[PDB]
Amino acid sequence: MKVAVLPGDGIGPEVTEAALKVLRALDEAEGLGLAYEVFPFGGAAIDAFGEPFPEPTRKGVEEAEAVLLGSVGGPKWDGLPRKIRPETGLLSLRKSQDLFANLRPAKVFPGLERLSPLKEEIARGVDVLIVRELTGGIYFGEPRGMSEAEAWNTERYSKPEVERVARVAFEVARKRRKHVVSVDKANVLEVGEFWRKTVEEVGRGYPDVALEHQYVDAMAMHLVRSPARFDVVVTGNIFGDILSDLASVLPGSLGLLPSASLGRGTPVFEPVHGSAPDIAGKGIANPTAAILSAAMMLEHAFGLVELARKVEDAVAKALLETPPPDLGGSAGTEAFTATVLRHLA
Amino acid sequence: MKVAVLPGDGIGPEVTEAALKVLRALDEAEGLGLAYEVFPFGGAAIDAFGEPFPEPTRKGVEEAEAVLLGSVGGPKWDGLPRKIRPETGLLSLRKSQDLFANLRPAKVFPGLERLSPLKEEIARGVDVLIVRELTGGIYFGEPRGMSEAEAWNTERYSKPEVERVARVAFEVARKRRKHVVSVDKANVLEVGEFWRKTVEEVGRGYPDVALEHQYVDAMAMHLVRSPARFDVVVTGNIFGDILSDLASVLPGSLGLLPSASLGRGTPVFEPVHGSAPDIAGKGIANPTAAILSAAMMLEHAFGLVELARKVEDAVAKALLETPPPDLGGSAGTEAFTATVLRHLA
Question: Where does the record place the site Important for catalysis (chains A, B)?
Answer without folding.
Answer: 139, 185
